[PDB]
């Protein structure tokens with residue numbers, strides 16, 4: 001028997017129900033076979049030549065997909081947007097009336113019938129991009145153990161004493177300012193503390209914002225960008241996942257944007273889970289207003305590489321799995337770990353040696369006390385990583401040319417020389433900004449600097 | 453290999469616009485996804501690197517930066533050698549001076565024209581830069597020399613040679629043609645400050661240490 | 673420290689019936 005189909009709208013006490021069919025609404029009567037109360041809103045029903053509902057099927061699975069905008073206060077209708085940026089108000093189906101529907105979800109809808117039947121799952125990549133993988137542990141950083149303990153004291157201490165603060169009616173400090181030398185491992189401490197915080201609650205987000213690129217000089221747009229960043233931070237804090245907001249290169253900036261930043265910090269102070277971490281290499285240039293007691297009370301000073309850390313850093317980079325030359329193994333009876341340790345000690349000692357190969361910088365003063373800085377100074381974790389990469393490249397070149405695999409100290413020395421030659425340019429044009437960049441680390445203003 | 457030329461057009465930035473604002477995210481996501489593949493390499497070129505947002509240039513996706521500096525005297529000699537080939541006809545007057553040694557004549561001509569172009573003659577003055585604290589700075593043509601200008605110099609010299617063989621009937625090429633091409637190119641580019649680039653001004657400011665106050669085009 | 677005025681760029685859009 002030829003039987004049509006339609007979409008149920010609502011029920012009535014008179015055992016009659018409204019059905020949308022063929023583009024028009026009709027008030028059909030329910031057959032005695034079916035139970036009127038058993039019908040669900042939005043359920044597809046079967047019609048016949050006499051326009052009587054006798055059977056009820058499932059929900060439709062094909063049609064237009066619309067993005068949900070909001071849910072109305074009545075709890076039965078939702079406002080969505082169509083494919084052509086056309087917004088509509090459509091009734092929700094029974095299955096849609098834990099799980100909680102959220103704005104941005106994609107829903108199957110029928111514009112003619114004005115019903116939404118199902119939710120189509122979608123995977124967002126913005127959350128993955130915004131956060132970072134907590135892959136930086138305490139062991140991943142070396143030579144900063146006291147910094148690690150200071151960060152632990154500043155961050156994890158209130159968590160174990162939250163009830164103490166609640167009884168005492170106080171506000172734990174959530175402001176940590178990491179100030180130290182030219183970018184070496186300053187941001188890596190932020191990754192380490194984020195990973196450690198993720199470990200304790202056993203999902204993790206890290207919002208990194210640079211300083212110079214944030215500036216929107218023309219008219220007040222930088223305040224708008226900061227407000228947007230803090231609104232995103234609040235949205236992330238809505239979810240029960242710790243979020244760390246990190247600001248990098250904040251010495252470039254600071255009647256100005258400082259009051260807006262202070263207001264946003266005061267607003268986010270209520271969210272104690274969010275941790276604000278700022279980095280700046282020039283504590284003198286930073287306006288003391290942000291350093292006032294309250295928000296950013298905790299300040300942590302970092303440095304470089306105590307030589308041992310460089311060795312620790314080399315061990316982290318030049319692990320035991322790297323190939324080793326047979327001739328160098330002959331000096332250590334085939335003990336790979338001992339050979340690696342001795343090679344690291346040798347290269348670190350040579351790098352921090354006052355020799356003719358360390359003429360990187362020549363420093364002149366007002367009295368003319370021309371001295372020479374060596375490779376020990378200005379050493380950095382990024383520079384050591386680049387040295388390791390260049391050494392690996394040189395070892396690969398030697399393998400493909402000579403044919404003998406392994407690692408040699410000559411590769412390390414060549415990588416050191418090439419990387420110092422490369423690094424002679426990026427921080428040191430020596431007319432601008434170098435005077436302060438060397439005077440802050442040394443402790444006295446330098447009239448003239450030259451590169452040898 | 454995917455070659456993104458003139459990366460100023462797209463992927464530049466999103467904050468300053470005065471959808472194009474929705475191009476960087478999907479490109480970065482796709483590059484991150486394809487990073488796992490060993491044989492996929494992305495190459496980009498751009499005149500103005502400042503307009504490109506650092507997000508795509510962060511370590512990871514775009515981890516290699518290569519700066520192509522303006523040629524120097526040796527680079528100019530190499531470029532001229534790459535273009536002043538022995539296959540071009542050479543006039544008998546210059547060729548006889550080397551007893552038919554084409555290579556010696558060509559390399560001597562290349563050295564002569566390189567020395568002429570890079571010389572600090574009063575005719576080679578190009579720009580005057582004013583500094584508030586300092587006295588002043590003088591910039592010559594050599595500070596804005598490039599391989600394309602060398603190619604155009606060679607082309608103009610060859611055009612002059614063609615006109616000479618049409619007007620007098622003597623085939624070949626002469627050093628006078630190269631010198632005339634050099635001086636004509638310098639006069640032609642004297643008026644336009646087009647040779648200057650934001651990178652050049654940044655380098656000049658980082659050399660002197662003081663911001664520029666005024667730029668003047670010297671002319672006789 | 674200056675203000676700007678915007679010029680729009682219409683995007684392609686077409687529907688049937």
Ligand SMILES: Nc1ncnc2c1ncn2[C@@H]1O[C@H](COP(=O)(O)OP(=O)(O)O)[C@@H](O)[C@H]1O
Nearest residue numbers: 140141142183184185186187188313316381382
């Ligand atoms: N103790 C360390 N152990 C391992 N790697 C380190 C250490 N210190 C610094 N590094 C390396 O130095 C690099 C510096 O990265 P980043 O912090 O983003 O730049 P900057 O140092 O300029 O802030 C990091 O990629 C990190 O791998």
